[PDB]
Write a protein that binds this ligand. Structure first.
Ligand SMILES: *[C@@H]1O[C@H](CO)[C@@H](O[C@@H]2O[C@H](CO)[C@@H](O[C@@H]3O[C@H](CO)[C@@H](O)[C@H](O[C@H]4O[C@H](CO)[C@@H](O)[C@H](O)[C@@H]4O)[C@@H]3O)[C@H](O)[C@H]2NC(C)=O)[C@H](O)[C@H]1NC(C)=O
Ligand SMILES: *[C@@H]1O[C@H](CO)[C@@H](O[C@@H]2O[C@H](CO)[C@@H](O[C@@H]3O[C@H](CO)[C@@H](O)[C@H](O[C@H]4O[C@H](CO)[C@@H](O)[C@H](O)[C@@H]4O)[C@@H]3O)[C@H](O)[C@H]2NC(C)=O)[C@H](O)[C@H]1NC(C)=O
Ligand SMILES: *[C@@H]1O[C@H](CO)[C@@H](O[C@@H]2O[C@H](CO)[C@@H](O[C@@H]3O[C@H](CO)[C@@H](O)[C@H](O)[C@@H]3O)[C@H](O)[C@H]2NC(C)=O)[C@H](O)[C@H]1NC(C)=O
Ligand SMILES: *[C@@H]1O[C@H](CO)[C@@H](O[C@@H]2O[C@H](CO)[C@@H](O[C@@H]3O[C@H](CO)[C@@H](O)[C@H](O)[C@@H]3O)[C@H](O)[C@H]2NC(C)=O)[C@H](O)[C@H]1NC(C)=O
Ligand SMILES: *[C@@H]1O[C@H](CO)[C@@H](O[C@@H]2O[C@H](CO)[C@@H](O)[C@H](O)[C@H]2NC(C)=O)[C@H](O)[C@H]1NC(C)=O
Ligand SMILES: *[C@@H]1O[C@H](CO)[C@@H](O[C@@H]2O[C@H](CO)[C@@H](O)[C@H](O)[C@H]2NC(C)=O)[C@H](O)[C@H]1NC(C)=O
Ligand SMILES: *[C@@H]1O[C@H](CO)[C@@H](O[C@@H]2O[C@H](CO)[C@@H](O)[C@H](O)[C@H]2NC(C)=O)[C@H](O)[C@H]1NC(C)=O
Ligand SMILES: *[C@@H]1O[C@H](CO)[C@@H](O[C@@H]2O[C@H](CO)[C@@H](O)[C@H](O)[C@H]2NC(C)=O)[C@H](O)[C@H]1NC(C)=O
Ligand SMILES: *[C@@H]1O[C@H](CO)[C@@H](O[C@@H]2O[C@H](CO)[C@@H](O)[C@H](O)[C@H]2NC(C)=O)[C@H](O)[C@H]1NC(C)=O
Ligand SMILES: *[C@@H]1O[C@H](CO)[C@@H](O[C@@H]2O[C@H](CO)[C@@H](O)[C@H](O)[C@H]2NC(C)=O)[C@H](O)[C@H]1NC(C)=O
Ligand SMILES: O=C(O)CC[C@H](NP(=O)(O)OCCNC(=O)c1ccccc1)C(=O)O
Ligand SMILES: O=C(O)CC[C@H](NP(=O)(O)OCCNC(=O)c1ccccc1)C(=O)O
Ligand SMILES: *[C@@H]1O[C@H](CO)[C@@H](O)[C@H](O)[C@H]1NC(C)=O
Ligand SMILES: *[C@@H]1O[C@H](CO)[C@@H](O)[C@H](O)[C@H]1NC(C)=O
Ligand SMILES: *[C@@H]1O[C@H](CO)[C@@H](O)[C@H](O)[C@H]1NC(C)=O
Ligand SMILES: *[C@@H]1O[C@H](CO)[C@@H](O)[C@H](O)[C@H]1NC(C)=O
Ligand SMILES: [Ca+2]
Ligand SMILES: [Ca+2]
Ligand SMILES: [Cl-]
Ligand SMILES: [Cl-]
Ligand SMILES: [Zn+2]
Ligand SMILES: [Zn+2]
Ligand SMILES: [Zn+2]
Ligand SMILES: [Zn+2]
Lengths: 687, 687
């Protein structure tokens, strides 16, 4: 038979291993010839595997690269202008790769050019609360200073935005061993830790879902009109550069000024973690100087788009997508995910060659330029937004399959919770000590739900990956799954190789296979189940949780709620109505031979995520349109619930016009209550 | 049998007459008790007639009324401050209505309060080109002047916007007999002309599709957060008041200053039509003083929403809607349309009582507060936008059925052209001299298409009526039809009564019946045809016409097109692609027992109008989202094609930064080409 088990059994760990090796021998940086050749290879193989059509979709988008003949670096400069210490020009390459060409040196993509010279201030993780502590509590002024911040906790673009708004004239990012060196594990190549010369690449944009900085709203096709660079979206205004902890130590060790305020500001280096500004007495006339000469350049990128046409509902799309571009070899990010997609395509294709087709159309995507701001997925979604709007059932992401070997991690819309619980109960756990047990059992034991006994944790989607446009802009039900730790030290470094994965993460490729089963099984059910496998009642449960949560934040300010008559009554009423209507819809869904009633009901299911979209967007973030979830304004990686109300309440005690600020809280309560009620009403009887 | 002919034959002229009489005995001003009682009556009758459900949908929106104890008027004031002439406080009521209560005196709805005193400038119709002529050619400065303008040619809100931007401190609107008194016809009550004491009421907002001024984007429900009045949408900044031509004569007769520039500035009164500013020598120290004391007031309004559930596709909606509120008796506007809707509901209900149901759901609407800015339709569409987005097949408007007795007038999306041609070929002409001939024959003879031999004229939709939110905001295929002249003199005056219609417009009610057949027949076909009755190829034809037209406007500036490399190549390419893809889709539609392929194809048809929506809206007009059509920025009543490019090109030779201005033309070309190609691609094979 051709059923989910046939699909799942055809997936092989050895194939995933072979593909991973194949995808990680040379760098595949977005916009480079190497990455275009890999696109062509994947296109050819997906055709061979049996897809109906496989095309490249190309766009010309703003990318950023160092200047090969004018390298980026940082100095300590003495009184006379002599550079007495320089940061590294490259990471020492790993064994056997010391002759590999085209390894991009560490840099922060989209940094402007400059050579700012000044006194250092250490800003911990450069989070919003770190700058509050500096400016409000310690009375330390970052204006015209170079800020040094440790990576971790939040997306690096938010750090740079925060430093810019504090008045910094440059930002140095570094990896502290506190955050990137696990106790008792050896550095690469003898373990999975970050050596002192390792450095994390990565973009520092604040795009808020715009896609290519030059063409917000529209695909960057051949005739696109482009904004000028001065009007581009999300570019930083000050130079930024990342360094490793050997180099950071040399920059921090001389720091003077104020002591760190408490232990949460101290990393693991043998330095005092003084905040500054500037260096201690003997070195007070020394300064730090950045030299950044990277350039932004409109460059062609290529997505591979494969189609497996549905037998019954070809105009309903289930999308499995993940990126292909990498900073260097992409041993984990993204090729551990891409190899899994490749094996999934191969397995679906095996069934297709035997005469099977899924009920709905499956689209498979190899996205380009994810690392430069989700550019490939976002431009393609901008190009196809009307098709996706009206036909998109679900999007399953497929970036890195493993970031650890401890347990599963799933982030998804509440509409997929039941699907994920049911699927994982039917899959075998790959975990030691759980042989013969289900993946649901091992996952639930290792990652318990905070609210429910005998249930696993499932997180909210934020951003920082290619589902963003589908979920937060377009309102298509989205999910992701990968293996995780109890992100990882070698992230975006030259050391993230095939050998890292094969030796230290997943020698048997069993965690990769488990992830392929989860992602592939979700796609299979979404594309083949007669009734779409979404449970609207799970959204009702979470909406009440989120409403309780946002009300509790507001209730920290009882006097103001009294003064400005701030009531959450409408939001709770809408949530209550959603719960009631969803229950009734579930009864009809269970109780309804009529394909029109079925499809009518499948359309109600498909458009339910869509109903949470507000076509006016969130305040000053027009491409974040989902009213229940948005990426946190303080950390793109984290999801925030009722974001419009959350941001209206955030730090509200500091606003100079409380009447206006509380007015805006009330406005956001009304928008949220209305959107919840409107979404509920899409589940009512249609006439 | 239950077919379209059964539906059409059940419609009766005598019923339409009885309903019109019933709806026009007392005023039904929006927000008044009288109009709530009429809503309740219609609700009850639609239930009796056989609809499945009939509900009131109420909202609390900003309305505007004169102050009953502090009347609005205008004076000529002499040097000493004595008011030597005053305009009328009311229109002399028509025979037999001189004791009717609650006739709102003439006023301009949403005028602010004030008592500005100053010198008059006469501005013709206060169109954009009239102000260009004044300021650029005649060097006449309106700043701090009271402007007097004749009604006609463009929506009165645009006149007020233009006067405000010219610096006027007040606007007086009047009806010139040149525009409102047909030669050889008697004034009311002995003919259909406007007497010298008649006055046109009407709102002067510039809402650009926002709906209630206080709640743009969201329905004005019980918990709505409202903007403060200073942030409200579309309110005028200067006092405005309308007067009749006896009073206008007294204001114009003393005008001095410059002569009218040419004959197109002269009306039919026995005055020189001097532009001013101010009065001739002997009266130079006299001024004009306005006294406006109207108030804006949040007020409850009520739409009646009736549902006839579809037998096969209950989740597809065909909507027949028209307003119920009137300025006074609403003899033509809107009750000539409302009486027709009422008879249409009655006829559909007769079929339903015999066991028939339409294939798709039909929704019937009696909208409130249309006269105050399309408020009732727009708030309801804001409330139900997700249902309408995903389920709305078509909207047929049903305001005034007759504005003349000469011929039919149809304005609609190209998607309905074929439907309208086919339907009118099957209806009898009511016209004298065409007995036994089709309505298509009489209409085509009287109103020939400018481009095609043996075809009738069909115009573009703009705004100024309740289809606006459905078509220009939401992208639901929309149409309207009414009888017209070869708008009308008594428009918005107390004289627009039942007797006006019965005596002078349509004594036999045959034109009303013809309009009921056209509107009802369109609804019947849209709700019952197996394949939706839309021909995408008709959109291809018009898109080429519009592209030729916009290119021709640009080509008035060859040097600039050379300098800034302004090419329309992408737009023509997209139009060519649309034409090709539409042709292929039509072949499949004709060539495809499979209800999924059918519904898949019906969905492609339904979402084709939807594909012309840009979720970012047009520049500075976020609620006008259709890229092919928008209401003209100079005249809300008129439709403009490729509005984004049109407005970018308009008066471009006057812009101080030609590089920036031509850059924006190129941007709008890209948006238009992309949207046309994207809409075309919705008609491609789906996978
Ligand atoms: C959740 O679903 C419930 C339906 O089960 C829905 O209930 C609706 O609530 C509204 C707002 O409370 C009700 O609105 C009232 O409607 C009546 C007419 O039916 C009006 O007369 C009321 O207005 C008077 O009272 C107001 C409040 O004191 C005054 O401000 C006002 O000036 C009037 O005096 C009022 O508008 C509505 O009838 C019910 N609908 C039902 C029961 O069917 C509720 O709104 C949903 N929640 C959300 C967030 O949408
Ligand atoms: C109307 O439909 C047609 C399809 O029938 C569609 O044609 C497409 O046009 C685009 C733009 O002209 C073509 O794009 C080219 O694609 C190739 C790869 O296939 C590229 O190599 C080309 O880029 C090179 O040349 C450019 C122009 O000189 C340079 O600027 C560039 O740097 C490169 O050197 C180019 O991107 C596309 O292939 C066709 N697609 C087809 C034929 O299938 C057309 O776009 C549609 N009209 C609209 C408005 O969408
Ligand atoms: C995840 O798995 C669960 C457990 O199988 C699924 O729930 C079960 O769904 C079935 C089919 O809808 C329900 O069966 C129905 O039972 C009622 C009797 O009350 C009957 O009227 C229907 O004809 C049908 O037999 C069953 O009750 C339900 N079990 C539960 C909720 O415990 C669930 O749907 C799966 N989730 C997915 C597919 O997203
Ligand atoms: C308006 O009326 C016209 C005239 O009847 C409709 O056009 C006609 O539509 C029919 C049905 O689709 C076409 O018949 C088809 O003919 C082809 C043979 O080429 C065959 O393959 C199909 O099986 C079917 O018989 C007919 O050709 C066509 N006539 C024309 C275009 O002159 C039109 O569809 C109506 N418009 C509406 C309903 O919106
Ligand atoms: C990755 O695998 C691909 C597919 O097997 C390899 O590309 C093939 O290489 C052979 C030998 O050079 C050619 O004859 C084929 O035409 C290629 N097939 C394609 C591109 O579809 C590629 O060599 C492998 N890369 C690495 C580093 O092992
Ligand atoms: C990258 O840096 C190089 C090396 O400094 C730049 O090349 C120089 O450009 C200037 C003109 O601005 C020439 O006069 C020099 O002769 C060049 N030097 C060398 C060694 O080639 C180059 O412009 C930079 N590339 C960019 C900014 O894209
Ligand atoms: C850090 O790097 C800089 C740049 O290469 C070095 O400074 C240069 O030294 C050369 C050779 O002595 C001079 O001719 C250049 O003018 C210097 N350039 C600048 C910008 O100062 C510097 O010596 C290096 N410092 C260390 C400690 O290695
Ligand atoms: C308009 O017609 C309606 C419906 O026939 C009339 O309202 C009815 O009036 C009678 C007698 O007063 C009542 O017994 C009914 O209850 C009413 N029916 C309703 C409201 O549905 C109304 O009188 C007519 N108005 C005019 C001016 O003729
Ligand atoms: C309408 O105009 C009346 C009449 O001038 C206003 O009523 C007066 O309001 C003032 C307070 O502002 C009182 O002191 C007077 O006694 C009132 N006069 C009379 C004759 O009643 C009224 O405010 C206006 N209504 C509005 C603005 O809604
Ligand atoms: C126009 O109307 C005004 C307001 O009613 C009249 O002026 C008033 O006249 C009365 C009685 O003589 C005075 O007590 C008021 O003080 C006046 N009010 C104002 C605002 O001036 C005026 O007489 C009328 N003019 C004509 C020609 O009828
Ligand atoms: O520009 C962007 O938005 C992201 C680009 C790029 N994405 P990528 O490195 O491939 O993946 C980020 C890894 N982390 C996650 O996906 C994540 C998200 C939420 C919670 C925990 C982890 C980056 O973070 O630099
Ligand atoms: O606020 C609005 O947009 C319009 C309100 C109100 N609409 P209403 O008087 O009922 O109908 C306007 C009549 N003219 C049209 O509909 C029309 C539209 C396009 C071309 C020719 C005529 C008005 O024009 O004052
Ligand atoms: C920080 O420093 C600059 C002076 O160089 C000043 O303009 C700015 O206002 C300072 N901010 C605070 C909070 O002291
Ligand atoms: C794999 O799991 C083992 C056992 O818990 C652990 O020692 C090792 O650190 C894990 N590898 C990685 C990369 O986390
Ligand atoms: C119109 O009049 C005022 C002077 O009262 C002046 O400020 C304004 O600039 C004038 N405009 C022109 C074009 O002369
Ligand atoms: C009705 O038609 C007749 C004949 O052409 C004409 O004399 C009359 O003016 C028309 N009535 C109206 C209101 O247009
Ligand atoms: Ca873009
Ligand atoms: Ca509103
Ligand atoms: Cl992922
Ligand atoms: Cl109409
Ligand atoms: Zn990644
Ligand atoms: Zn990455
Ligand atoms: Zn009207
Ligand atoms: Zn009107």
């Amino acid at each position: 038979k051709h059923n989910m088990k046939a699909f799942l059994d055809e997936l092989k760990a050895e194939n995933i291993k072979k593909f991973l090796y194949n995808f990680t021998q040379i760098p595949h940086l977005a916009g480079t010839e190497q990455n275009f050749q890999l696109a062509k290879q994947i296109q050819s193989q997906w055709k061979e595997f049996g897809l109906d059509s496989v095309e490249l979709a190309h766009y010309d988008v703003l990318l950023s690269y160092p200047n090969k003949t004018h390298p980026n670096y940082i100095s300590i400069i003495n009184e006379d202008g002599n550079e007495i210490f320089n940061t590294s020009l490259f990471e020492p390459p790993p064994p056997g790769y010391e002759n590999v060409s085209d390894i991009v040196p560490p840099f922060s993509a989209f940094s402007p050019q400059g050579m700012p010279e000044g006194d250092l201030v250490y800003v911990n993780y450069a989070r919003t609360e770190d700058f509050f502590k500096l400016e409000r509590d310690m009375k330390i002024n970052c204006s015209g200073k170079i800020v040094i911040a440790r990576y971790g906790k939040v997306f690096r673009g938010n750090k740079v935005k925060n430093a810019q708004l504090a008045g910094a004239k440059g930002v140095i990012l570094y990896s502290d061993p506190a955050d990137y060196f696990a106790p008792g594990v050896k550095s690469y190549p003898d373990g999975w830790n970050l050596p002192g010369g390792g450095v994390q690449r990565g973009n520092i944009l604040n795009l808020n879902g715009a896609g290519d900085p030059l063409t917000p709203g529209y695909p960057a096709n051949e005739y696109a009109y482009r904004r000028g660079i001065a009007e581009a979206v999300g570019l930083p205004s000050i130079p930024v550069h990342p360094i490793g902890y050997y180099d950071a130590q040399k920059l921090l060790e001389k720091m003077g000024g104020s002591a760190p305020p408490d232990s949460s500001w101290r990393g693991s280096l043998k330095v005092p973690y003084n905040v500054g500004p500037g260096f201690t007495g003997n070195f007070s006339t020394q300064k730090v100087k950045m030299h950044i000469h990277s350039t932004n350049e409109v460059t062609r990128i290529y997505n591979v788009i494969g189609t497996l046409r549905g037998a019954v509902e070809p105009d309903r799309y289930v999308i499995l997508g993940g990126h292909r571009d990498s900073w260097v070899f992409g041993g984990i990010d993204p090729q551990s995910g891409a190899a899994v997609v490749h094996e999934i395509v191969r397995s679906f294709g095996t069934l297709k060659k035997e005469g099977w087709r899924p009920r709905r159309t499956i689209l498979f995507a190899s996205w380009d330029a994810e690392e430069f701001g989700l550019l490939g997925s976002t431009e393609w979604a901008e190009e196809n937004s009307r098709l996706l709007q009206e036909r998109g059932v679900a999007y399953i992401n497929a970036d890195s399959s493993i970031e650890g070997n401890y347990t599963l991690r799933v982030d998804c819309t509440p509409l997929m919770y039941s699907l994920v619980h049911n699927l994982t109960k039917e899959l075998k756990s790959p975990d030691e000590g759980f042989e013969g047990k289900s993946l649901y059992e091992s996952w639930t034991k290792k990652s318990p739900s905070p609210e429910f006994s005998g249930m696993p944790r499932i997180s909210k989607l934020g951003s920082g990956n290619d589902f963003e446009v589908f979920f937060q802009r377009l309102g298509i039900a989205s999910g992701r799954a990968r293996y995780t730790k109890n992100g990882y030290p070698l992230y975006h470094s030259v050391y993230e190789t095939y050998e890292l994965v094969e030796k230290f993460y997943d020698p048997m490729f069993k965690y990769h296979l488990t992830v392929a089963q989860v992602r592939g099984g979700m796609v299979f059910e979404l594309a083949n189940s007669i009734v779409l496998p979404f449970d609207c009642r799970d959204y009702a449960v979470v909406l009440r949780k989120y409403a309780d949560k946002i009300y509790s934040i507001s209730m920290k300010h009882p006097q103001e709620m009294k003064t400005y008559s701030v009531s959450f009554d409408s939001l709770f009423s809408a949530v209550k109505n959603f719960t009631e209507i969803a229950s009734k819809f579930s009864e009809r869904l269970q109780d309804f031979s009529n394909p029109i009633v079925l499809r009518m009901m499948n359309d109600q299911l498909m458009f339910l995520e869509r109903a949470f979209i507000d076509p006016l967007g969130l305040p000053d973030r027009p491409f974040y349109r989902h009213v229940i979830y948005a990426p946190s304004s303080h950390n793109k990686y984290a999801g925030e619930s009722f974001p419009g109300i959350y941001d209206a309440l955030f730090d509200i005690e500091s606003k100079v016009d409380p009447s206006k600020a509380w007015g805006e809280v009330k406005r956001q309560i009304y928008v949220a209550a209305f959107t919840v009620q409107a979404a509920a009403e899409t589940l009512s009887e249609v006439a």
